Amino acid sequence: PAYHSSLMDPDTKLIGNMALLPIRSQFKGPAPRETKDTDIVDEAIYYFKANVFFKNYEIKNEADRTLIYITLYISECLKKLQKCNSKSQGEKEMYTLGITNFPIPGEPGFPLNAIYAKPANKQEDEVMRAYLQQLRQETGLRLCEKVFDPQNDKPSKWWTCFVKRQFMNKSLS
């Protein structure tokens, strides 16, 4: 079946019902620092092409929810990367996009409000808003030295093609 995250620990920090998972990045955010060479953003980009085709997804950890979030986002980047002609540019479009405020668990316009808990107060709201943008950032750039072939202006059709498909028939946009 679909691919599930395995970064869940018997001691993982939780932001909402999502997993506050360590993500080696230089962006600001409540993201713990990671020592293991693979983070929740790798796991997401690795499984993307396989996961996106699934319509159903059984949540097993707060870790999954983060995976599902990073995945849905990936589709958003591809929606963008489909248009542009350079890795340099793409990296910019992912900083910009990675900043736009997409709805969050609890707001209208956020698909999956029955699976994602809403922040219990104004602190979590900011923490979460800040743990998420952090992810739309890290995820946003790592997705550039993938979607672009050593010969720029070339958004590999290997990624472009998924632009019309939506994981779980859901969309952040």
Partner 1 sequence: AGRLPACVVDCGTGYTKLGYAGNTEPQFIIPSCIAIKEVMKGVDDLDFFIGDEAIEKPTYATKWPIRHGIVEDWDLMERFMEQVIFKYLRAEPEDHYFLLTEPPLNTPENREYTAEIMFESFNVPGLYIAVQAVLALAASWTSQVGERTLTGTVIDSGDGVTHVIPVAEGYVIGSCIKHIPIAGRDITYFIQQLLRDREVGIPPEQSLETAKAVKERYSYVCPDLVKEFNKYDTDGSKWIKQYTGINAISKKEFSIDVGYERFLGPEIFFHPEFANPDFTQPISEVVDEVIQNCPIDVRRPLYKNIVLSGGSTMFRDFGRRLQRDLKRTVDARLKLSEELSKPKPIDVQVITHHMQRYAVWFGGSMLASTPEFYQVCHTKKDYEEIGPSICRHNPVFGV
Binding site residues, partner 1, CB under 8 A: 1, 3, 46-47, 49-50, 53-56, 157-158, 160-161, 163-165
We find the least distance from the C-beta atom of residue 163 to partner 1, in angstroms, to be 8
100 or 169, CB closer to partner 1? 169
Q: For 9-20, b where at least 16 C-beta lie within 10 A, e where not — what string? A: eeebeebbebbb
Closest listed residue to residue 99, CA positions, set 139, 148, 64? 139
DSSP-derived secondary structure for 47-91: HHHHHTT-S-----SHHHHHHHHHHHHHHHHHHHHTS-S-HHHHH
13 or 154, CB closer to partner 1? 154
Three-state DSSP state, 13: strand
60 or 157, CB closer to partner 1? 157
We find the least distance from the C-beta atom of residue 161 to partner 1, in angstroms, to be 4
We find the least distance from the C-beta atom of residue 50 to partner 1, in angstroms, to be 4
We find the least distance from the C-beta atom of residue 1 to partner 1, in angstroms, to be 7
38 or 100, CB closer to partner 1? 38
Alpha-carbon distance values, 4 to 1, 13, 40, 58, 143 (Å): 9, 18, 11, 9, 20
